[PDB]
Structures are given as structure tokens and as C-alpha cells.
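#struct-pred

JT: dropping the chains for the assembly here, can someone run the whole complex?
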Amino acid sequence: ANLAAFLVLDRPEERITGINDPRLRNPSDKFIYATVKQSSVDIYFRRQVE
Amino acid sequence: MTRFNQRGVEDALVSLKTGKLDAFIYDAAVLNYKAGRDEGCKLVTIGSGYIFAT
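RK: done, full complex below.
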């Protein structure tokens, strides 16, 4: 039972599932994420105020 | 309580984290929010709160 629970359910969340993850909402020194400098992504994030 | 009064929500939360402090008594909204954006959710309140003097 416990080996099945370990190898089935509690899988590390290597996926962030978009930008609604509170880990990316409040980052730290561990999760470093970035985008290419001076591009549409930069413009979009700069425009959005939240 | 007055024997070891803390000072500041963040300081009291840190003291709880290390183990110097064992329990915190404060508002319900602030503690619900603290538990909401706590990284890893190690601290948990009791029930729905509003235990006394709603």
C-alpha cells in the first residue's frame, strides 16, 4: 500500500500549470524564471499591473 | 502571557518556525491569510477560527 502510494500519488510537481501558481505569484531565490529581454513578453508583463 | 510577550506578526511566526514559541493568539483574518500564502503550509490554524468574541 505505501509503495503504491509513493510511486503513484505523491509525484513532484515539476509542472507549474500556468501563471496562477502561488509559487510564481510570490517567488524566492529558488524558482528563477525569466524571459528574453526586450520582447513581447516583457511588454505584456510590464503593461499588466497586478 | 505577559511573561514572554512577542513583538510583530512576522517575528512571532519566525519564533514559531524555529521552536522558541509554541502557539500564537491573534486575529482570525490575519492568521487565515498567513496560512494562505505560507510556503509549504506547515502552520495550520484550528477549525474555522472565530473561536472567541466573533
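JT: nice. Chain A touches chain B at residues 22-23, 26, 28 (CB under 8 Å). Chain A has three helices and no strands.
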